[PDB]
């Protein structure tokens, strides 16, 4: 079987859905969504998405430590539970495309590794034509240059405690220097 949804995520499919955002330090990326659009999502949590299974270090999760190796093909993502009634999933990705630079491979800012790659995992068919639509609108914003997956959500595994809130646990923490709401 597989793991696609959050153990620890408030989600109630009878009204919510689901959206996996990778956007480098999944840090500012939980901050970012957070700080403007907390009061309209549901909840959400980090963690890592579509990577290699036979790389996992534990039989039903993949650690901080073990992706941090660079070689496990695990995004750090931001996972969001969201009720379409209130927010769009349009709203969520043009917010997406405003809070990092997706022209990077690999990396975001000074964070390197296939772990920071600019990413959409879509949680259904439907959401991922509609993903790809999106990108294709954002492409001459951003240089006719996006280097954003987008791709069925075919893994997810929490992040540690420690690393949900962490921004707002600990303000003085690292902050990406492109991690910032764009005009």
């Known amino acids: 079987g597989s ?9 109630d ?16 990326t ?16 980090v963690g890592y998405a579509n990577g290699e299974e036979s790389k996992k270090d534990s039989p039903s999760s993949v ?26 999933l349009r709203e969520l990705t043009d917010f997406f495309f405003r809070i990092h630079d997706p022209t990077t491979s690999n ?3 000074p964070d390197k590794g296939t772990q920071y790659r600019s990413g959409l995992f879509a949680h259904s068919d439907a959401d991922l034509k509609e993903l790809a639509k999106i990108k294709e609108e954002w492409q001459p914003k951003w240089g006719n240059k996006i280097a954003t997956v987008i791709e069925p959500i075919k893994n997810f595994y929490d992040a540690e405690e420690y690393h949900q809130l962490y921004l707002d646990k600990n303000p003085q923490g690292y902050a990406c220097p ?3 709401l764009r005009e």
């Not at 499919?13 to 500012?28: E, Q």
């Not at 969504?33 to 309209?40: A, E, F, I, V």
């Open 3 to 11: 793991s696609l949804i959050s153990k620890t995520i408030k989600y």
């Open 13 to 28: 499919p009878a009204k919510d859905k689901l959206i996996t955002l990778a956007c480098g330090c999944f840090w500012g």
């Open 30 to 45: 939980e901050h970012m969504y957070r700080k403007y659009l907390n009061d309209r999502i549901v909840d959400c949590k």
């Open 63 to 88: 650690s901080y430590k073990r992706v941090c190796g660079g070689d496990t093909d695990f995004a750090e993502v931001l996972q969001v539970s969201y009720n379409p009634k209130v927010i769009t």
């Open 107 to 109: 990396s975001q800012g």
């Open 178 to 180: 492109t991690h910032y």
